[PDB]
Amino acid sequence: DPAKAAFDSLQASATEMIGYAWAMVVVIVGATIGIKLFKKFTSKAS
Amino acid sequence: DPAKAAFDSLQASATEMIGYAWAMVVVIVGATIGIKLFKKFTSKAS
């Protein structure tokens, strides 16, 4: 009874945090791959 | 015996009292174990 409510609130907080994490990852990985492709295509085009 | 009546009343009181004590212990122990398990499972799940 008091414990069910507690667990429910914890799960909700964790769901929001996973949401923020996905947002950050996208921006960092975007940059990394961007730079990689730039270096690659510039050199092949000569 | 002058004392026979006295002993019977003691017997009766003791029976009732044992009854009350069992009720209290259940409630206290319920709480204690409840809190313990909450702390344990929350941390393992995280």
Query: What does R_g of chain B's alpha carbons equal in angstroms?
Result: 21
> Which H or E run contains A30?
helix A2-45
For chain A, the structural domain boundaries read 1-46
Resolution, rounded to a tenth of an Å? 2.8
Resolved by: cryo-EM
- Give the distance from residue A19's alpha carbon to the nearest chain B alpha carbon, in angstroms: 16
C-alpha distance from residue A12 to each of A2, A18, B19, B39, B42 (Å): 16, 10, 43, 18, 14
Cα A3 from Cα B42, distance rounded (Å): 11
Could you tell me which chain A residue has the CA closest to the CA of B38? A3
- The residue of A1, A4, A7 whose CB has the most chain B CBs within 10 angstroms, and thus the best one to mutate to test that interface, is A7
CA distance B19 to B6: 21
Inter-chain CB proximity B42 and A3 less than 8 Å = no
Which tokens sit at B33? Answer: 């174990």
**CA distances in angstroms from B11 to A3, A23, B7, B25, listed in the order given:** 42, 73, 6, 22
What's the CATH architecture for A1-46?
A: Up-down Bundle (1.20)
